[PDB]
Amino acid sequence: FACKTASGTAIPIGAASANVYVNLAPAVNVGQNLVVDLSTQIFCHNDYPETITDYVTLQRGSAYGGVLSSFSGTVKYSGSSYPFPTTSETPRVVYNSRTDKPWPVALYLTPVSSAGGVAIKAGSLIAVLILRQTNNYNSDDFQFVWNIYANNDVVVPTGGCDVSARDVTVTLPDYPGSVPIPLTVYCAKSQNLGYYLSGTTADAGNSIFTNTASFSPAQGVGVQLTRQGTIIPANNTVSLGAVGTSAVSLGLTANYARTGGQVTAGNVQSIIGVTFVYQGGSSGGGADVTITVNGKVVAK
Ligand SMILES: *[C@@H]1O[C@H](CO)[C@@H](O)[C@H](O)[C@H]1NC(C)=O
């Protein structure tokens, strides 16, 4: 049983522990989300098929590591789906040829939110998989571990929906003026989706985000979000209707809005969160998207 990664790196044969660096492409799917499809990342063969037939199983206790360790999901192992972390034995994968074959494994996460995400940095541990190798001629076995590490920066979705970006920055024209906010959402299947804004507001109406610019800021002005002129206050669910596989724009626009007194020259900045919720669902977790709105009041 000899394996290698898609990037050509050999996995130490017969080692009790190995660190395997792999690329992940997480995605929302119906009922569960893909974290990493290892069948496109790990390829294995038998160097001596005439003298031995290799059998490899995934063992109980295989689980996500690091920032994913509190999430439950499933593992698809050679066509069969199991709870992950693993509590059951898996069928054997037979290696009876010198021709490379993908290691038929994909790791999934059970959706818990509407459009939440978990950032995975490159070089971080994503899973600790326990393998057991046997053969067809004697009772010798070998139990070893593959520590799966991320090659790339990725965001693993934790809900039924995903966004065009997790962080969006827009620049308003000089006061007064408006700018569209490019931000869309889609769901693996049709969801009655909504969202709400969060941040710090300056007004009684809870609809003008405070200017938090630290250097030479303006006074008397904040940032207000609109949807075709309609004003969106903070902490107020806005329905998007039914959102399916085709991306739906939130239709948001940033504007300046007065907070009292003269609007004076300087920088304007507001950091606004966007959190998605299903119709009649709880407002769990933090912001799904962070919008940074920059602006400037210029003295005449
Ligand atoms: C948002 O609204 C909900 C419902 O009234 C309330 O429980 C929560 O405290 C509000 N949060 C803020 C920051 O106003």
Numbering used by the authors: 1 to 300
What does the paper say about this structure?
FimH is an adhesin positioned on the fimbrial tip which binds to mannosylated proteins on the urinary tract epithelium via its lectin domain (FimHLD). FimH is composed of two domains, an N-terminal lectin binding domain (FimHLD) responsible for binding to the terminal mannose moiety on epithelial glycoproteins, and a C-terminal pilin domain (FimHPD). FimHLD transitions between two endpoint conformations: a ‘closed’ conformation with a high affinity for mannosylated proteins, and an ‘open’ conformation with a relatively compressed structure, a wide mannose binding pocket, that binds to mannosylated proteins with low affinity. Conformation and ligand-binding properties of FimHLD are under the allosteric control of FimHPD, which itself exhibits only minor structural changes upon ligand binding.
Among all conformationally stabilized FimH-DSG mutants, FimH-DSG TM was of most interest as it harbors the two Glycine loop mutations G15A and G16A designed to conformationally lock the mannose binding site in the ‘open’ state. To verify the conformation of FimH-DSG TM, the crystal structure of a FimH-DSG TM protein containing three glycosylation site mutations (N7S, N70S, and N228Q) was solved by X-ray crystallography at 1.9 Å resolution. There are four molecules of FimH-DSG TM in one asymmetric unit which share high similarity, therefore, structural analysis was done with protomer A. Introduction of the glycosylation site mutations did not appear to alter either the local or global conformations of the FimHLD and FimHPD. Comparison of the structure to previously determined structures of FimHLD confirmed that FimH-DSG TM lectin domain adopts a compressed structure with an open mannose-binding pocket. Clear electron density was obtained for the Glycine loop, wherein the G15A G16A mutations were introduced which induced a local change in the loop conformation. A15 projects towards the inside region of the clamp loop, providing rigidity, which causes the loop to widen at the end by ~1.2 Å (I13 Cα-S17 Cα) compared to the WT residue (G15), thus stabilizing the low affinity state. Additional rigidity is introduced by the G16A substitution, as it projects towards the bulk solvent. In comparison to previously published structures, the donor strand complemented FimHPD did not exhibit any conformational changes. The backbone of the exogeneous 7-residue Glycine-Serine linker that connects the FimH and FimG peptide could largely be resolved, and does not impact the conformation of the lectin or pilin domains in comparison to previously published structures. Analysis by mass spectrometry confirmed that FimH-DSG retained a single glycosylation site at N235 in the exploratory antigen initially characterized in this study.
